Design a protein around this ligand. Structure first.
Ligand SMILES: [Ar]
Ligand code: NA
Length: 240
């Protein structure tokens, strides 16, 4: 997250760190949202590499004992069947991970609430992105979970030529594009949290930013629109 602030420890208890085995150690690669005690929602593109993955729930600092973490292996990966790794602009950037254990819920570990199917936020609706991604284009991962205030940019504006043009789809949410604050590499798969009728819901799965830079004016961060995939998600979990 570029231009973020450190989240307080209990703000976003559905946020997970998706990690892969590198050497014999684990490295953060992506975010995700806990949606069942044994299921995580992330970006399809996060789990293209044939890697060993684990999930950390209750994580705040990637490099320090928080005293709240639970570390759980990924047992099964279900990528959206229409996902195409060489075509992120086509959408379908979403995957579900079945965990090897069911995590214990507490103030640091809660299920993320998803929007009702078909819900589209009005232009300039207030949202936070969260994650441990780069804090500057071509920078380094955050140590502590970051948040940034990223208002939505509706499809009509986002798909305009000075924004993302034909790249963005109605199956996506755009947010930010102020040139200061954005998602960045390592935030992929994580949530966009938007406050509706007094409660946050996870409206986005972080998908992509511009090839020119993370925080580029009129290139808002682009997210898979969670409310497009409610049936898909439930179908996967009910068959798995
Ligand atoms: Ar990203
Ligand atoms: Na930690």
């Amino acid at each position: 997250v570029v231009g973020g602030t450190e989240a307080q420890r209990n703000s976003w208890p559905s946020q997970i760190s998706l990690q892969y085995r590198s050497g014999s150690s684990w490295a953060h690669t992506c975010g995700g949202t806990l949606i069942r005690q044994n299921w995580v929602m992330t970006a399809a593109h996060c789990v293209d590499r044939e890697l060993t993955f684990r999930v950390v729930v209750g994580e705040h600092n990637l490099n320090q004992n928080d005293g709240t973490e639970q570390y759980v292996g990924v047992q099964k990966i279900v990528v959206h069947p229409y996902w195409n790794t060489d075509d992120v602009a086509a959408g379908y950037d979403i995957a579900l991970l079945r965990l090897a254990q069911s995590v214990t819920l507490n103030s640091y570990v809660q299920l993320g609430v998803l929007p009702r199917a078909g819900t589209i936020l009005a232009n300039n609706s207030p949202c936070y992105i969260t994650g441990w991604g780069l804090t500057r284009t071509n920078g380094q991962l955050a140590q502590t979970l970051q948040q940034a205030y990223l208002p939505t940019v509706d499809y009509a504006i986002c798909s305009s030529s000075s924004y993302w043009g034909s790249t963005v789809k109605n199956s996506m949410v755009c947010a930010g594009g102020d040139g200061v604050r954005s998602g960045c590499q390592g935030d992929s798969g994580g949530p966009l949290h938007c406050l509706v009728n007094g409660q946050y819901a996870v409206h986005g799965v972080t998908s992509f930013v511009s090839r020119l830079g993370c925080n580029v004016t009129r290139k808002p961060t682009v997210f898979t629109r969670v409310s497009a995939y409610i049936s898909w998600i439930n179908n996967v979990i009910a068959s798995n």
